[PDB]
Write a protein that binds this ligand. Structure first.
Ligand code: CA
Ligand code: CA
Length: 446
């Protein structure tokens, strides 16, 4: 025989001056590089608000060692970038497959986070165009229009200008930053998803692009990355589509999972329905029942999508999409092999065949609390059809292996170029982020 490395800590308290670290994401690029991203939770392990949380990343190239970590996204003050998701994706450009590594994160202005998030996209739509909202101490609404020029609520121009990094300028002088809690004009205290990308195998990253405008619905309060990774669809009519799992709340503070997706390689995004959205329930107005929260997605051989969801029930809920993430079958069953103690989980597609079948790999804490981290192997079996004739895929969990007997919380899986598996996970102690590699045999023996 078995292969199983001694776990190494890629981030730990004090590293890069940060008190805390959480929320692993893990992706392998087409060059074979492993990318591990993390919340750099500088003021401690606690969620936003009141935490200067940045995006950090470590790289391990094929036949290489872990490069030291660096911060690749850093907002002013204690404005948080929290919960990352990575995605290696490709496009055919003039006969070569060009790789772009996508990363989305959730973003809050200073002072806000999940428990006190306000609602809305953060944007005002004026004649088809979306403009960043700014608020003053008296709760008046302002808009940032062309040239960054700020307009008050009468549609009139003010002496304020907001730069794209939210710096505020009044008559040539800087007067604050709209993400900061002492600024005279403030961005709406609500959740954004922001995206960066890398075209050089994860070494350098773009400036953040906000994905809220024309994507997040005004009734949504929380609207955030489901941490871990997304996937680019390989099979079917939606081949090439980028799919990032997310979740959000409504006015009732009810959490619903979903995916956002892009058919032009990141340029524009659409929101799929939640699995909560059925013929009788609407995720806009639902107020009771099982909440579906953090989630990860895998693809079936025909391009059918399977969304595995943290939820307030005892077991993992799995939803199926026949249209590439736009909607989900109204039956959302539990899988009773997958005890789910209300913790993030990871599920990935495996490139190789196992026992002559296509397979997926799953990890989460297999217990009634965040302990006993287990990695499971599921074989995809075709089994008849749904009411609408669609293929039925089901999962034979052939291996179930404890990789972390004690504490174990959020985790993320990735496949290594040689077919081995990597695992980035919380569980070795406050702010300690561990990475280990292993082969299939290790999962089978035990
Ligand atoms: Ca920062
Ligand atoms: Ca649960």
């Amino acid at each position: 025989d078995v292969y199983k490395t001694q776990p190494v800590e890629l981030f730990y308290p004090g590293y890069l001056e940060s008190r805390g670290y959480r929320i692993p994401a893990l992706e392998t690029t087409k060059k074979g590089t492993v990318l591990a991203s993390i919340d750099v939770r500088n003021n401690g392990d606690h969620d936003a608000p009141n935490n200067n949380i940045d995006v950090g990343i470590r790289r391990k190239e094929v036949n290489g060692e872990w490069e030291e970590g660096k911060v690749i996204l850093d907002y002013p003050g204690k404005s948080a970038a929290i919960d990352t998701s990575l995605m290696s994706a490709t496009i055919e450009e003039n006969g070569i497959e060009k790789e772009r590594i996508f990363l989305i994160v959730t973003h809050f202005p200073e002072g806000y986070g999940f428990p006190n998030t306000e609602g809305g996209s953060g944007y005002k739509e004026i004649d088809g165009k979306y403009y960043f909202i700014l608020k003053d101490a008296q709760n008046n609404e302002y808009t940032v229009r062309e040239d960054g020029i700020v307009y008050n609520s009468e549609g009139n121009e003010t002496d304020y200008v907001m730069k794209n990094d939210k710096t505020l300028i009044q008559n040539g002088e800087e007067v604050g930053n709209a993400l900061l809690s002492n600024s005279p004009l403030k961005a709406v205290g609500t959740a954004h998803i922001e995206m960066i990308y890398s075209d050089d195998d994860g070494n350098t990253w773009s400036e953040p692009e906000d994905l809220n405008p024309g994507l997040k619905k005004e009734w949504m309060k929380f609207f955030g990355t489901a941490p871990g990774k997304g996937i680019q669809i390989k099979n079917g009519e939606h081949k090439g589509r980028l799919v990032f799992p997310i979740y959000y709340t409504n006015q009732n503070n009810f959490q619903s999972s979903a995916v956002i997706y892009s058919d032009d390689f990141g340029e524009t995004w659409k929101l799929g329905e939640s699995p909560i959205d059925t013929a009788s329930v609407s995720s806009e107005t639902v107020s009771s029942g099982t909440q579906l929260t953090e989630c990860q997605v895998v693809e079936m051989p025909n391009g059918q999508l399977k969304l595995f969801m943290r939820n307030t029930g005892s077991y993992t809920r799995i939803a199926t999409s026949f249209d590439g993430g736009a909607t989900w079958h109204d039956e959302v069953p539990e899988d009773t092999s997958l005890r789910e103690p209300y913790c993030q989980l990871s599920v990935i597609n495996y490139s190789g065949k196992i026992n002559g079948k296509d397979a997926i790999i799953f990890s989460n804490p297999d217990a009634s609390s965040r302990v006993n981290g287990s990695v499971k192997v599921g074989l995809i079996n075709e089994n008849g059809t749904y009411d609408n004739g669609e293929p039925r895929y089901e999962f034979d969990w052939i291996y179930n292996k404890t990789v972390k007997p004690g504490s174990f919380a959020y985790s993320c899986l990735t496949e290594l170029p040689d077919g081995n598996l990597g695992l980035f996970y919380e569980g070795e102690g406050a702010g300690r982020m561990a990475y280990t590699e292993f082969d299939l045999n290790y999962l089978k023996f035990n």
